[PDB]
Design a binder for this molecule. Structure first.
Ligand code: NA
Ligand code: NA
Ligand code: NA
Ligand code: NA
Ligand code: NA
Ligand code: NA
Ligand code: NA
Ligand code: NA
Lengths: 491, 491, 491, 490
């Protein structure tokens, strides 16, 4: 039993989905299109204009112009704040449309898209609306003969690329901080998930964003992706997605000495210590990995359990795994949707095979589910060791690896022995051991007796090969900023 | 008349010069040595142990181990501040020694190595010892169910590579900020100028630095340099030198998703507007380019002159160029010493040639000077245009191009039309013009009615191809930190 | 002639004006009422419920209980930020009603209350709405054995008392910062101008403020004001008004060791140096004193003019003083309305007399104007000396004193020679002088080539007897915060 | 028996001079007063006595040093250097300063050396580092203006400090004020002027230009009032009794002088049911007995969960009777005398008042030894919230121990006080520690510890325990005026 389609999403899917360049909704200069799918049913869900290299130079020129002259270059910070703020309101106004688009286009459940994704995107904008007037430089006291101050100047035209797992919320992670600073934007959504953002384009127009401040260019990584990465007149690039493609972007960026920001993958450890509150910790371990179908860079894909509790938690995770209600995002019953694509499904089925072939046991799941659509069963793997492919590599599906350990110093050593370092979970009732452990984990975010919490105000990012830089909080601003130290001789 | 050699610099130079690894003075593991020259006389100044890849490896291991355990991992921020402070005192103490080594090894005049270099380095250390206790994170008010806090953790083992133009002071730009955050160090000084730093090693030992906190690995870019940029166990990398080599570093760093900071070359404009205080602006224009033999990334290598004053400044720059007293850095009368090497003298005479062949006029200088040593005459070029190699590329010598202009909007445009953006100078008595112009120039440092000022407390660095990141100031600390977001569930 | 009453101000004025306690519009417990006047006609404007000691108690209990429990105490910073922003929207929707109310009740011209007062009140609440999410504390690295962190906790219930010269805007200076930290508020408007704020009360309720977060108690200083400064359960106090009463408030606050923030009077200098753009400076000097009929603690009430220009600026100010069009605030052609009260007209006419008695000359104005109304003619005094009453005391009317000077060193001395230090203006085209002079003036804000500019983002407050603390900008938050330093032993 | 350092003997062999305008001077009118050794009750030294006219010479010297000459023209680096040189000298003279503290204040030598001197050295080192990092803001409002703020030194500051940590308290005051570029008129307590007056040599030697610091010993109604009421002092800072604080703020009002106050307390130290009991017992005991209880943030109220009450009472009584009482300059002393006759009497009198309202003295409750201002460490039992000794700052080694049955009950009883200086929480639970910390109305909260202070971390009172914070970056704001500059560039 189904969620009735919102009239505005009907009217929107009923037509070719246009790109948004220089204030206008447009086709690709050359007329190419591509299809996005409903991953639950595998039908074409919409036909979308495809940005080629040439649509990207157009988007760069519009952003370059909006950055140098016209209202965006001349507004006070109070006016810019006010724009970002009205955007937040219109989005909030269209919350149901956007959540349906996310459910339909990404696959995730409607009600979680609404409660989590949409509300976070709104609040992110609202939080960044707030920074615009508060991005301060320094005055530095050095000597009587000089006034010394710094300016935090927006770097300019920003190229941003985002993946398909939290489409709209990620557009906001990118654009809220970049906009707060006065930059202009050329942003490409993922091929699997363009609809969320191109719908939101209506909302930027209604809010009154001047022409060119924001430019949305959907398409493929080798064409629209590359053309952004390689553009001579883009001042800075931010990317989230595969550790692999990150390497590429940094390499390409070398050429222009362009600042890079990278939010990449993870194999984040979720540590249940001997004195954890097991009630809570089991739920955390399960939510840790299963939330968004495991399609989450910071998923707790390695669940470490003290030996005392090992069997209890395996038994619980197994029971909860076989209980998940799989089905369509737009069906009210659904607890976990399908994976985003056929390719994504095949890759995680592959990993499960490698798991088996390496000698690990599947204690639940391990295979596809349902009649059509890209589903996989929640999977729990057991009898696992540290050097196994499934324990080392990011799978990006509802697949968890559970790992006994015997001492605190041991679990920190094994949690840290990864070139990933996005996130980590620690479950202990003890005040001393919670901080001591959090301190010693090499990870950008540590939750003590929780997991998977994000907020506009708290920075998020990787150590080691999980990333360069932070997004969210005050920290994300520095990425979009170029520091100028002015010395005024006054002797 | 010669500056008399210091007893301690004589003893140091009488022996093979050792590397500094894990608290110990040592030879290269394979016993290789290389020679470093006195650029005034072309003699061998010293023989120096040469670090190979395996030496770099021993430096990383010693750094990794001083980072994870032992006194440096365990001491309070106050004990760390004190070490850095005592270091600065010890340097102040051996100031004449270090100044002679800079005169001898690098070439610059003794007195200016004493008053500028040694003194700035001492001051940089003292400024940074002050940060150690004040490196602060946030507590973030989000919700009554969580304590949210960030930690600024040292990134770990830091690979650092510096050039030959301000050898000691440049070692402090790297080490001050890094050590202040708790980081550990493997640092390579330039093949041309290893002595300052290797002498200074005595002082880190004497100050009581724990073993392996700091490691000094003299040698070549293809060997020691590459081994640092490629090492898998180095967490972060910092480099200053050619935009050329910067690109290579950034590209290799991509493999490991390693954070990079780059301080690179410039073609910095020094702009003399109509209402300049002309007597002042003339000296700033001459000093802007001639200071340190023009071997200065932020040299005012393009002097822009409002047309009314163009002839006047040229004549002055010519008369001044021809009066500089060239000689050995250890002779008392010397105002400008030799260029650092035969290679550098060739690169610069070459640029001058290209200058002549593209139609520019050599108004003063234009050739080598004296019987021996790597000397080039201070050089003034007129009848230049924006598209000339000599006006577009970094020469890295005492060579200046003078350009007339007719309007402020014109000179703004022409100053900015460059891939570089390290520094700029503007001279004007007017309150509005000063800041308007400063705001409009794309440059990491803008001096209004001054030039070439640096201080520990003020960040320095390039826009565009002049770099990524900042050194000095609070800002430099961010380069050596990883931000950890901790969520403490208190529901 | 006349601007017609808005329907909603008509409805509001046909009725007894109710107070606002604990989310309810109420009468005084004892049912007392008082009158407020149109200063243009002397007519009764409205009758208003009069808060007594018992009404303050009821207000404080409601604020205390809204601080300790219920939605305001539970809600996230995001929700709290959102309430403050919806408030600002409503104030903007009612912009015309609020401006009429201000013109009618305080006396200033409608157009300026609308363009200045209301828009600045909107912008102040928009600005602080952004802060609630960014009131950050510190994590302080001291020793591995501890976690150190500080929380900025809201002080609690705060008592705020404001004057009559900018009634609504001044309510936002106090409440914007206080509410952003999560404090609750008991606020008393001036007896001359309660209307704005009590109309604004609808808007707090309609925006969804929880019961008791905000409580408005109109009345008199000996009853309602006194009950506020003396109340044992009010945690913190903030006042703006005469230096005299500030003294009283600070004294009284000593008995409870209560943080005080005071915003008081001035005798601010506006200084025209030899190389000023004389045209902009003349206008700047005239607006500086004449804006808001001189009822402005930071009015440029001593105009210092370099000798070469004295006569020119005296002529122009006399002519300008003679030309201002005096009229009711609700007549469309009026440039300056009347002073707020009979008492105020009397005090300033008295100052004028005194000025005359001490041997100063009245170059313009110096007497009442029109048939009815608390009007006073814009007034210019010449032949003044530094120890005269009129040049030392705050007059709070459209009365200015013009003094010649001969050197920069001289005018700095004379400007600073005052117990006041609220503000200062300097007019010069020279980049050195503008900064030199502004560095040496003892004033909380200094305008170089302008005057009377305020913005939510820039701090305002006085040196010496002009006050304690700052309002506006990030700085104002500190006044409403109590710093907690937490030590977590993790040994 | 610890022997006098030769430079300490030299210092005490002479009348003790004030320090004004870089000069060691006698009082203009020639008055002197005595300071005593509170272990032996003999005069320890005869000190020049500052009168109103001396404070007035000090303010002039200070005003002049702020407004012109080297202290007003130095780079922040030069100024930092002077502060660091001071810290070194203090460290060089650590044994001398420690002995003076032990002799003048009464505290044990080893503690004076290990705590007081090292803390004061650290404070100056810490603040020397700030002088270069006192930054203001550049504020992006509009393109027509450059907006920036300067954090300027407020000017000549007036500082008054108590006798319980004489040298460290001179640093909490001077460190942050000097870092901002202010100049100083400082009065040490009449009971303990010596450390400061010795340290004055080190300021001169470090190269402080004349009149940057000026030290004026004497009495609160003469030198003290002169400072608070002086027309040319820009700002005032005081630490001492809640009562003198009211007077200070009261007087300060007349000139709209910024006040910073650090005052008394009755701080709770709360042992919950899941504390580590061995650790919480030691902390409860140190928390009150450290520095003989003459410590505004002494945990003078120990709340114990009912389950553990009798256990901790037993241990506190045992440890209270174990402390070794004696002279500060004697090798084995763990706790010395109170600072004066008047203090010893105030405290015995609080003891009487507790007995007579019905509390039981489970240990101590009377003077100790033949001569000197000693009182036995004292533990109070059968106490209720209502009693004098439980509401009022006693300021001696006297603890009151109270049972509680619930976390809500103890939080409310801890908070039910006009004080809020500090608090301690003992519990092994991660949630409970931060919830409780969050709820206590107190400027610093220690979780599983007590009495920790460090130059980096703010210290200060809620409610009547003070206004403002000292230490940390926070302290700088008290010594600063914020100037907001607008530059029209339209
Ligand atoms: Na799709
Ligand atoms: Na990384
Ligand atoms: Na050399
Ligand atoms: Na750059
Ligand atoms: Na009225
Ligand atoms: Na004041
Ligand atoms: Na004494
Ligand atoms: Na207080």
């Amino acid at each position: 039993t189904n969620i009735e389609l919102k009239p505005k999403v009907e009217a929107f899917l009923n037509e070719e989905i246009k790109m948004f360049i220089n204030g206008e909704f447009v086709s690709a200069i050359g007329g190419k299109t591509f299809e996005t799918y409903n991953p639950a049913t595998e039908d074409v869900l919409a036909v979308v204009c495809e940005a080629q290299e040439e649509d990207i130079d157009a988007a760069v020129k519009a952003a370059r112009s909006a950055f140098e002259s016209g209202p965006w270059a001349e507004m006070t910070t109070a006016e810019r704040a006010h724009l970002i703020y009205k955007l937040a309101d219109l989005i909030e106004e269209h919350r149901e449309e956007l959540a349906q688009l996310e459910a339909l286009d990404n696959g995730k459940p409607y009600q979680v898209a609404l409660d989590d994704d949409i509300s976070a995107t709104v609040e992110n904008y609202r939080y960044y609306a707030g920074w615009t007037t508060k991005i301060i430089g320094q005055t530095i006291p050095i000597s009587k003969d000089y006034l010394n101050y710094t300016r935090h100047e927006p770097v300019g035209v920003v190229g941003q690329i985002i993946p398909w797992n939290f489409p709209l919320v990620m557009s906001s992670w990118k654009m809220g901080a970049a906009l707060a600073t006065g930059c202009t934007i050329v942003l490409k959504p993922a091929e699997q998930t363009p609809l969320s953002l191109l719908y939101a384009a209506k909302l930027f127009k209604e809010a009154g964003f001047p022409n060119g401040v924001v430019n949305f260019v959907p398409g493929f990584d080798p064409e629209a992706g590359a053309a952004i990465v390689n553009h001579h007149d883009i001042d800075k690039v931010a990317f989230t997605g595969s550790t692999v493609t990150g390497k590429y972007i940094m390499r390409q960026s070398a050429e222009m000495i362009k600042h890079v920001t990278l939010e990449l993958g993870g194999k984040s450890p979720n540590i249940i210590l001997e004195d954890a509150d097991l009630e809570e910790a089991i739920n955390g371990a399960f939510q840790g990995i299963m939330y968004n179908h495991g399609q989450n860079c910071s998923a707790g894909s390695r669940v470490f359990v003290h030996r005392k509790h090992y069997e209890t938690v395996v038994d619980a995770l197994v029971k909860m795994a076989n209980n998940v209600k799989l089905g369509a995002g737009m069906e009210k019953e659904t607890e976990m949707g399908p994976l985003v694509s056929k390719k994504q499904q095949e890759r995680v089925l592959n990993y499960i095979e490698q798991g088996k072939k390496e000698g690990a046991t599947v204690a639940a799941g391990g295979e596809r589910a349902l009649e059509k659509g890209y589903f996989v069963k929640p999977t729990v793997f057991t009898d696992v060791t540290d050097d196994m492919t499934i324990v080392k590599e990011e799978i990006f599906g509802p697949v968890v690896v559970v790992l006994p350990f015997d001492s605190t110093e041991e679990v920190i050593e094994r949690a840290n022995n990864s070139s990933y370092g996005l996130a980590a979970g620690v479950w202990t009732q003890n005040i001393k051991t919670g901080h001591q452990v959090a301190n010693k984990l090499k990870a950008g975010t540590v939750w003590i007796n929780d997991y998977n919490l994000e907020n506009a105000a708290a920075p998020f990012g990787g150590y080691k090969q999980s990333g360069i830089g932070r997004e969210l909080g005050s920290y994300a601003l520095d990425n979009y900023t170029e520091v100028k130290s002015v010395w005024v001789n006054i002797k």
